[PDB]
Write a protein that holds these residues in place. Sequence first.
Motif, PDB file in Angstrom:
ATOM      1  N   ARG A 116     -10.039   5.595  -7.889  1.00 29.20           N
ATOM      2  CA  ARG A 116      -9.617   4.376  -7.560  1.00 29.20           C
ATOM      3  C   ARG A 116      -9.820   3.846  -8.716  1.00 29.20           C
ATOM      4  O   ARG A 116     -10.938   3.592  -9.551  1.00 29.20           O
ATOM      5  CB  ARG A 116      -9.687   2.964  -6.009  1.00 29.20           C
ATOM      6  CG  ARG A 116      -8.982   3.778  -4.798  1.00 29.20           C
ATOM      7  CD  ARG A 116      -9.751   2.928  -4.106  1.00 29.20           C
ATOM      8  NE  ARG A 116     -11.421   3.705  -3.066  1.00 29.20           N
ATOM      9  CZ  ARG A 116     -12.050   3.018  -3.579  1.00 29.20           C
ATOM     10  NH1 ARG A 116     -11.525   1.504  -2.714  1.00 29.20           N
ATOM     11  NH2 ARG A 116     -13.714   2.895  -3.238  1.00 29.20           N
ATOM     12  N   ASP A 125      -6.511  -4.844  -7.247  1.00 30.88           N
ATOM     13  CA  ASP A 125      -5.813  -3.915  -6.884  1.00 30.88           C
ATOM     14  C   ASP A 125      -5.892  -2.718  -7.728  1.00 30.88           C
ATOM     15  O   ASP A 125      -6.602  -2.285  -8.712  1.00 30.88           O
ATOM     16  CB  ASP A 125      -4.476  -4.569  -8.019  1.00 30.88           C
ATOM     17  CG  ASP A 125      -3.826  -5.672  -7.065  1.00 30.88           C
ATOM     18  OD1 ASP A 125      -3.466  -6.133  -6.245  1.00 30.88           O
ATOM     19  OD2 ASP A 125      -3.263  -6.781  -8.168  1.00 30.88           O
ATOM     20  N   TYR A 126      -5.669  -1.734  -7.213  1.00 33.78           N
ATOM     21  CA  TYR A 126      -5.961  -0.060  -7.482  1.00 33.78           C
ATOM     22  C   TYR A 126      -5.101   0.244  -7.731  1.00 33.78           C
ATOM     23  O   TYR A 126      -3.874   0.562  -7.317  1.00 33.78           O
ATOM     24  CB  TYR A 126      -7.123   0.444  -6.977  1.00 33.78           C
ATOM     25  CG  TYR A 126      -6.773   0.503  -5.066  1.00 33.78           C
ATOM     26  CD1 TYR A 126      -6.482   1.847  -5.155  1.00 33.78           C
ATOM     27  CD2 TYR A 126      -6.983  -0.388  -4.386  1.00 33.78           C
ATOM     28  CE1 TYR A 126      -6.033   1.580  -3.786  1.00 33.78           C
ATOM     29  CE2 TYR A 126      -6.903  -0.422  -3.316  1.00 33.78           C
ATOM     30  CZ  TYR A 126      -6.720   0.818  -2.687  1.00 33.78           C
ATOM     31  OH  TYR A 126      -6.345   0.488  -1.591  1.00 33.78           O
ATOM     32  N   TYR A 159       1.260  -1.107  -0.028  1.00 30.18           N
ATOM     33  CA  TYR A 159      -0.379  -0.133  -0.299  1.00 30.18           C
ATOM     34  C   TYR A 159       1.278   1.246   0.174  1.00 30.18           C
ATOM     35  O   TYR A 159       2.072   1.310   0.922  1.00 30.18           O
ATOM     36  CB  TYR A 159      -0.888   0.022   0.987  1.00 30.18           C
ATOM     37  CG  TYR A 159      -2.004   0.766   1.051  1.00 30.18           C
ATOM     38  CD1 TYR A 159      -3.096   0.754   0.209  1.00 30.18           C
ATOM     39  CD2 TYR A 159      -1.746   2.186   2.127  1.00 30.18           C
ATOM     40  CE1 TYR A 159      -4.128   2.124   0.379  1.00 30.18           C
ATOM     41  CE2 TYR A 159      -2.392   2.696   2.292  1.00 30.18           C
ATOM     42  CZ  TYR A 159      -3.357   3.764   1.235  1.00 30.18           C
ATOM     43  OH  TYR A 159      -4.275   4.502   1.545  1.00 30.18           O
ATOM     44  N   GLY A 196      -3.106   0.580  -3.605  1.00 29.20           N
ATOM     45  CA  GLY A 196      -3.374  -0.474  -2.844  1.00 29.20           C
ATOM     46  C   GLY A 196      -4.021  -1.957  -3.782  1.00 29.20           C
ATOM     47  O   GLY A 196      -3.995  -1.660  -4.606  1.00 29.20           O
ATOM     48  N   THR A 197      -5.059  -2.594  -2.543  1.00 30.98           N
ATOM     49  CA  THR A 197      -5.311  -3.561  -2.572  1.00 30.98           C
ATOM     50  C   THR A 197      -6.640  -3.852  -2.299  1.00 30.98           C
ATOM     51  O   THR A 197      -6.082  -3.471  -1.178  1.00 30.98           O
ATOM     52  CB  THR A 197      -4.774  -5.173  -3.525  1.00 30.98           C
ATOM     53  OG1 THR A 197      -3.225  -4.561  -3.909  1.00 30.98           O
ATOM     54  CG2 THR A 197      -5.725  -6.237  -3.696  1.00 30.98           C
ATOM     55  N   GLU A 198      -8.363  -3.906  -3.106  1.00 30.77           N
ATOM     56  CA  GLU A 198      -9.261  -4.015  -1.660  1.00 30.77           C
ATOM     57  C   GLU A 198      -9.841  -5.400  -2.239  1.00 30.77           C
ATOM     58  O   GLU A 198     -10.182  -5.545  -4.156  1.00 30.77           O
ATOM     59  CB  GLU A 198     -10.086  -3.398  -1.954  1.00 30.77           C
ATOM     60  CG  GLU A 198     -11.449  -3.741  -0.814  1.00 30.77           C
ATOM     61  CD  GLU A 198     -12.405  -2.426  -0.950  1.00 30.77           C
ATOM     62  OE1 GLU A 198     -12.658  -1.798  -1.697  1.00 30.77           O
ATOM     63  OE2 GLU A 198     -13.172  -2.577   0.264  1.00 30.77           O
ATOM     64  N   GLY A 199     -10.552  -6.966  -1.412  1.00 30.39           N
ATOM     65  CA  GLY A 199     -11.354  -8.288  -1.918  1.00 30.39           C
ATOM     66  C   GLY A 199     -10.065  -8.782  -3.622  1.00 30.39           C
ATOM     67  O   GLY A 199     -10.742  -8.439  -4.128  1.00 30.39           O
TER      68      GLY A 199
END
Length: 220
Positions: free
Chosen positions: A195, A176-177, A4, A170-173
């Motif tokens: 994002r 990646d973004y 992140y 970062g990353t969520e679920g």
Amino acid sequence: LPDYVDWRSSGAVVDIKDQGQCGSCWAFSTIAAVEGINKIATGDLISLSEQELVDCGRTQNTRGCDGGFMTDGFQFIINNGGINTEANYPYTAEEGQCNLDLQQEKYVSIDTYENVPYNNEWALQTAVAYQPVSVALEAAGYNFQHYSSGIFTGPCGTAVDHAVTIVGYGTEGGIDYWIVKNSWGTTWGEEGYMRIQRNVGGVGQCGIAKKASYPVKYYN
């Protein structure tokens, strides 16, 4: 590299700005990138002048409110030996004659600039891990225009018609973004930010990896 990165979290990003009715995006992207490296290198956050680039940075390809290039932006700042502040040379969303007095006041300097190798999200991630990065992407589409929240995954073309600034990732679920700072004011996207999907390959989402560059300051 970190999992992140968010340059806003370390005070390296000036509050969201609005380019208004002027295709000056290249200038906002240039300035956001320079503002970022200046804080990272020197320790001080200073809001810098887009208007100066618009008025004083015209080239064959960079044409004020009629579009331009961040590399020409960086070239101007190097060639001029610096850039004035937002407060001293305020933004009017209109092209004007270059104010020579204000051009001569230099509060922030850069040493060089570099292009991120094209179509290479890893090289881009490497760059973003160290500082904000200027990029151009395909922003013309309905869904991009009406983006309000979440991770933007398209649809979008790959034409580089609009400049923004990557200020982190970062990353969520598992998704990646990139964190992108736009110059459409706080009422677009996630209070001015987006994002946008990362690690999609090739030219990157909406062509984000096609034309990335950043200003260089040698010392930290």
